[PDB]
Coordinates of C-alpha atoms and ligand atoms in Angstrom, one line a residue:
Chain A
X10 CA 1.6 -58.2 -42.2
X11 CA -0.6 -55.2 -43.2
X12 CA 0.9 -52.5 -40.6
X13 CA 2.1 -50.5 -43.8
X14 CA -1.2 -50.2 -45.4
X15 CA -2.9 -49.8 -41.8
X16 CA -0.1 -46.8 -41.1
X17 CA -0.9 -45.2 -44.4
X18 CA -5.0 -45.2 -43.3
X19 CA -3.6 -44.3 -39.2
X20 CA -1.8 -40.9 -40.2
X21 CA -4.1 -39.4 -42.6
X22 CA -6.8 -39.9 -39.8
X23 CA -4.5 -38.3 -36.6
X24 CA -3.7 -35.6 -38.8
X25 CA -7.2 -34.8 -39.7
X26 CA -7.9 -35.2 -35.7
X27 CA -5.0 -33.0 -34.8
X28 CA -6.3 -30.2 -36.9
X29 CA -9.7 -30.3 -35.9
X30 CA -8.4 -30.8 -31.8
X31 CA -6.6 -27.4 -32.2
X32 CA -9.6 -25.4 -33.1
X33 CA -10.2 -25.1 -29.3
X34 CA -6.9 -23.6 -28.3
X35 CA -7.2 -20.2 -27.0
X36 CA -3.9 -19.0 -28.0
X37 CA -3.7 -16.0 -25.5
X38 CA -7.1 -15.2 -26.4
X39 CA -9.8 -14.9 -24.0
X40 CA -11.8 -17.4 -25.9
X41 CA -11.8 -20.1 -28.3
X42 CA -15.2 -19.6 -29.3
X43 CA -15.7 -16.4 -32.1
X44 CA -19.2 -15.9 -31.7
X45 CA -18.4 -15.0 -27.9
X46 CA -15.9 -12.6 -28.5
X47 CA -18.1 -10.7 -31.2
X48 CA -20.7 -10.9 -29.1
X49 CA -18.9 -9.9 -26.0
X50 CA -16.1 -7.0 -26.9
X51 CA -16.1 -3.8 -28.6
X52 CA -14.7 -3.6 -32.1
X53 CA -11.1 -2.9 -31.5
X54 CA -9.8 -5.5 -29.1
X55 CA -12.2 -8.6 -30.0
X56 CA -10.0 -7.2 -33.3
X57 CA -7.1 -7.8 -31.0
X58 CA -8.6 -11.2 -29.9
Chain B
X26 CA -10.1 19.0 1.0
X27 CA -6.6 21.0 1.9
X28 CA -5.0 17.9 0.1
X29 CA -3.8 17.4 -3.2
X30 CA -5.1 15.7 -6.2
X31 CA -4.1 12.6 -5.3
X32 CA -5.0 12.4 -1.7
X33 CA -8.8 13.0 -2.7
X34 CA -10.7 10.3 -1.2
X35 CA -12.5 8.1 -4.0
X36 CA -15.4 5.4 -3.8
X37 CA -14.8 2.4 -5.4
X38 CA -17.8 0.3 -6.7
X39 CA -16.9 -2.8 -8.5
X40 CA -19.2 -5.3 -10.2
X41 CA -18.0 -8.9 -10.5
X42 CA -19.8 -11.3 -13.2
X43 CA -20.3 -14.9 -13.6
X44 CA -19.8 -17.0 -16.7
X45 CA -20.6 -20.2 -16.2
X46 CA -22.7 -23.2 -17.1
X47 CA -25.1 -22.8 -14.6
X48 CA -28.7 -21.5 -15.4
X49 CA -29.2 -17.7 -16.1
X50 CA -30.9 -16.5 -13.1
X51 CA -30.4 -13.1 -13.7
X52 CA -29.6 -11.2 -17.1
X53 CA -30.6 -8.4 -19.8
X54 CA -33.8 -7.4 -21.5
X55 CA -34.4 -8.7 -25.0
X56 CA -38.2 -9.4 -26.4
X57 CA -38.2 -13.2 -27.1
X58 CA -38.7 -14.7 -30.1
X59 CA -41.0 -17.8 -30.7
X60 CA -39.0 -21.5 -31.7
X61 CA -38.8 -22.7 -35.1
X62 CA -37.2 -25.9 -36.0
X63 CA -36.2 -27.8 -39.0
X64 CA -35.0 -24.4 -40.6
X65 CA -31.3 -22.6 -41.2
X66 CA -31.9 -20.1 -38.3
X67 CA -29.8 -17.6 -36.6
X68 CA -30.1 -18.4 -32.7
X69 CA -29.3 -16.8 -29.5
X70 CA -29.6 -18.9 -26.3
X71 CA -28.7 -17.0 -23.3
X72 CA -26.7 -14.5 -24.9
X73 CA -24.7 -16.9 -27.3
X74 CA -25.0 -16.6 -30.8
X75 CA -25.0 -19.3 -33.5
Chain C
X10 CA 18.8 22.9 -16.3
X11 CA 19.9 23.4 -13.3
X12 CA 18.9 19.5 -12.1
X13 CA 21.1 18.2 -9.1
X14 CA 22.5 14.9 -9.7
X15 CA 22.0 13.4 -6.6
X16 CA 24.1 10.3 -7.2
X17 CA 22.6 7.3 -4.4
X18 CA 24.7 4.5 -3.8
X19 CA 25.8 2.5 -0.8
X20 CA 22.3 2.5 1.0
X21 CA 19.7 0.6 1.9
X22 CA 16.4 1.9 0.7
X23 CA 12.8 1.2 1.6
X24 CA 10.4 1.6 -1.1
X25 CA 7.6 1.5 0.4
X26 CA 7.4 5.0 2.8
X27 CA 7.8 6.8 -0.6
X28 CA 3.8 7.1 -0.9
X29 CA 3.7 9.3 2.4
X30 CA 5.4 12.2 0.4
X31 CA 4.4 14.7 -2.0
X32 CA 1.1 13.7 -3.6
X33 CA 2.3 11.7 -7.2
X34 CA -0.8 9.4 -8.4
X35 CA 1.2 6.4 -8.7
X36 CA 4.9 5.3 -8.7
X37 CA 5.1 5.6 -12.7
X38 CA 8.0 3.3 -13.5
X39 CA 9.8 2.4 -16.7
X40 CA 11.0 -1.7 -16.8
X41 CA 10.6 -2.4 -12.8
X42 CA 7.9 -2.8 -11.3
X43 CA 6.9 -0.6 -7.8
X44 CA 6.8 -3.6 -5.8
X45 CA 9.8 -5.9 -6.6
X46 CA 12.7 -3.2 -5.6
X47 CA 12.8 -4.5 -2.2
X48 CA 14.3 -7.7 -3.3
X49 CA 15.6 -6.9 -7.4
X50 CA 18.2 -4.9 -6.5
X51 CA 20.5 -2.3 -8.5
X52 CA 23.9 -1.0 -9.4
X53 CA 23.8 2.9 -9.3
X54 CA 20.8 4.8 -8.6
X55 CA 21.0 8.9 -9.9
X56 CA 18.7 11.4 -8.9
X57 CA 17.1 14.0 -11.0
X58 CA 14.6 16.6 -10.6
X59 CA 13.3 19.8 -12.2
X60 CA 10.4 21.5 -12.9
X61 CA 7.8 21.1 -16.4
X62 CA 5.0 22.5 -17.2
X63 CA 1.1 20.8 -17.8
X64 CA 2.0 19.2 -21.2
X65 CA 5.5 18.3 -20.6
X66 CA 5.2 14.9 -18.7
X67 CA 4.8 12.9 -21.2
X68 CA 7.9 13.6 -22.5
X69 CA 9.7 12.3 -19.5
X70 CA 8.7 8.8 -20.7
X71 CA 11.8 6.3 -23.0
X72 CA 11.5 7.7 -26.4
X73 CA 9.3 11.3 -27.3
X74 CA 9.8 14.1 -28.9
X75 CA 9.1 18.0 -28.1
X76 CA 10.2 20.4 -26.3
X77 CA 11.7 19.1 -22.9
X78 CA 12.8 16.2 -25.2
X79 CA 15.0 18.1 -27.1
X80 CA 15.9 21.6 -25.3
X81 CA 16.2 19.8 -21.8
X82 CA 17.0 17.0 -20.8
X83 CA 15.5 14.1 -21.8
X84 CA 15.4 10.6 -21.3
X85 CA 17.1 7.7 -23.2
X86 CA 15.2 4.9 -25.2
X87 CA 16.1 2.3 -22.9
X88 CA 15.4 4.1 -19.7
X89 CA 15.5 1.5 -16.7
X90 CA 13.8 3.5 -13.4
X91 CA 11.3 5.6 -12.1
X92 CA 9.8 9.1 -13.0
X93 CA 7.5 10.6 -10.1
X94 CA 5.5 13.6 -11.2
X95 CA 3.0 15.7 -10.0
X96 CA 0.9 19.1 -9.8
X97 CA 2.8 21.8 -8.2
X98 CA -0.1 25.0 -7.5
X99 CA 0.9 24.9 -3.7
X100 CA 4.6 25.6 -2.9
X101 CA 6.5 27.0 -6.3
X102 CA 4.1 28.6 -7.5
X103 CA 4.6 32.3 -6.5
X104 CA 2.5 34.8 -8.6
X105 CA 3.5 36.8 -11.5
X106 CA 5.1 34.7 -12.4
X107 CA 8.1 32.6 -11.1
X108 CA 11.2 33.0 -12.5
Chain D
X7 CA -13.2 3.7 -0.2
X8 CA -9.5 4.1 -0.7
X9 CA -7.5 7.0 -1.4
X10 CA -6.4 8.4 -4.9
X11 CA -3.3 6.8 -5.2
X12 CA -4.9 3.4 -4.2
X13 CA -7.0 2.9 -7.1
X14 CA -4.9 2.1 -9.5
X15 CA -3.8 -1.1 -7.5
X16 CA -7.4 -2.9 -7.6
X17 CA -6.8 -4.7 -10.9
X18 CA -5.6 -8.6 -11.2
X19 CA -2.4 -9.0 -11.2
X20 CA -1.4 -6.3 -8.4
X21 CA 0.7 -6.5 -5.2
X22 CA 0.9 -3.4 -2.8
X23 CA -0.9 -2.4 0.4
X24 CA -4.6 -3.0 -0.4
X25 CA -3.9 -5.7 -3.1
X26 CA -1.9 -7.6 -1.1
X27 CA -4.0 -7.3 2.6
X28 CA -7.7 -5.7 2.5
X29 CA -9.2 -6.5 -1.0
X30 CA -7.7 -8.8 -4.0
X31 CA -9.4 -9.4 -7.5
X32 CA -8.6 -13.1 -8.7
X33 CA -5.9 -13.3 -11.9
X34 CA -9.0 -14.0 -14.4
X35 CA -11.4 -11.7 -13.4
X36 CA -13.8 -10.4 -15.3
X37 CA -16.8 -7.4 -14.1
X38 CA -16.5 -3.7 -14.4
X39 CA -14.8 -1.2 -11.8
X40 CA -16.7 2.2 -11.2
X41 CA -14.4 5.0 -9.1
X42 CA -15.3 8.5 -8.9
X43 CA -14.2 11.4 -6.7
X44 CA -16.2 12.0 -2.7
X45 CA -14.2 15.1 -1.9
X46 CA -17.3 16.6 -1.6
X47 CA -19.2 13.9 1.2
X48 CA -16.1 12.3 2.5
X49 CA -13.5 15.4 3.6
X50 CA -14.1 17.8 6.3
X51 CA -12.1 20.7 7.3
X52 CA -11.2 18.9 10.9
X53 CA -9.9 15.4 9.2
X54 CA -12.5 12.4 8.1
X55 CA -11.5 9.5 10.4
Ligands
NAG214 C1 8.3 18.6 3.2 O1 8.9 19.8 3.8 C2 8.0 21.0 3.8 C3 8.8 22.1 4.3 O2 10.0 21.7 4.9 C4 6.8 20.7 4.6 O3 5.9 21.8 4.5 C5 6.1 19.4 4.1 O4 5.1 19.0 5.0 C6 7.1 18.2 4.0 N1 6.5 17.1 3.4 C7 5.8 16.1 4.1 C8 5.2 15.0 3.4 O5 5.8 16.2 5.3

C-alpha cells in the first residue's frame, strides 16, 4: 500500500547514487582521477584534461 | 649523405611505460618520508597524491 | 603564376609509389587522410605547382594570410586535398640568382 | 632505424608501411619517443645497406 511513500524515499536515493556514480566517467579525458593528471601532465594540457 | 633532408636516416628509441596495479619494481628517486597516522596529512604512495 | 593546371581525371591512381619521389617529409594533407585514397575515392583531381620561398609554406595551408596568400595564389578555407612541399637547393637553384 | 619520412608514422593510431607491417604502437599507448638524425654513423658515400 505504501509504494508512494517508498517511491518518494527510492528516487531521492538513485539520484544521489547517480551523481556520485558519474564522478568516475572519464569524459574523453585520460583520467577520472585529478590528482593523476596534476601529477602526471604539464600545465597546459592537464588544463586541457 | 648525397640525399635530401628527408631521406636522412634517423634512429628511433622509444620508451614504453607501465601503469598498472602491480607492485612498483622500478621507479624515480624521492627521499622517503617517515609514517604518521591519525593526522590530516598530505600523502604520496607510489607516485599518487592524496 | 605561371602554375600549370594539370587537370587528372579518368585514371586509376596508386598512392602509395608517391614516397619514392622527390624528398617531401610527409604527405601533408588537408581533410583525407594519406592512407584511405586507395579506397575513398574522388570526383576531379587538379594539379598545381609553383615555387615559394622558406617562410611561404605555411601559407599553402586552408585559411592564412601574407604574402603568397594574397599576391599568389592561395588556397580556399575549405580546401579538400593534398599540398607536398619541400626544400629545393639541388635542381632550381642556379646562382645569382634565378629568375 | 627508419628513414626521415618514416618517423612521423610511429604514433597510435597510424597505418602505412612500417605501422601497418614491421613495428605498431597499441591505440592507448603511453611512453616517450626519442628520434634524432645518424647521417653522420649510418650513410657512406658507396650506399649503407
Ligand atoms: C626526376 O627526373 C630527373 C631528371 O629527369 C632525375 O634526375 C631524377 O632522378 C628523377 N626523380 C627520381 C625520383 O628518379
Amino acid at each position: 500500500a505504501l509504494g508512494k511513500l517508498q517511491d518518494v524515499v527510492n528516487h531521492n536515493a538513485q539520484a544521489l547514487n547517480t551523481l556520485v556514480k558519474q564522478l568516475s566517467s572519464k569524459f574523453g579525458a585520460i583520467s577520472s582521477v585529478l590528482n593523476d593528471i596534476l601529477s602526471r601532465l604539464d600545465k597546459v594540457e592537464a588544463e586541457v584534461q | 649523405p648525397t640525399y635530401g633532408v628527408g631521406h636522412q636516416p634517423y634512429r628511433v628509441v622509444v620508451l614504453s611505460f607501465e601503469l598498472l596495479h602491480a607492485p612498483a619494481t622500478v621507479c624515480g628517486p624521492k627521499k622517503s618520508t617517515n609514517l604518521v597516522k591519525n593526522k590530516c596529512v598530505n600523502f604520496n604512495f607510489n607516485g599518487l597524491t592524496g | 603564376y605561371a602554375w600549370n593546371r594539370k587537370r587528372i581525371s579518368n585514371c586509376v591512381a596508386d598512392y602509395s609509389v608517391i614516397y619514392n619521389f622527390a624528398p617531401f617529409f610527409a604527405f601533408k594533407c588537408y581533410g583525407v587522410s594519406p592512407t584511405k585514397l586507395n579506397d575513398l575515392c574522388f570526383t576531379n583531381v587538379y594539379a598545381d605547382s609553383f615555387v615559394i620561398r622558406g617562410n611561404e609554406v605555411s601559407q599553402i595551408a586552408p585559411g592564412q594570410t601574407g604574402n603568397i596568400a594574397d599576391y599568389n595564389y592561395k588556397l580556399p578555407d575549405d580546401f579538400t586535398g593534398c599540398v607536398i612541399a619541400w626544400n629545393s637547393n639541388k635542381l632550381d637553384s642556379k646562382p645569382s640568382g634565378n629568375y
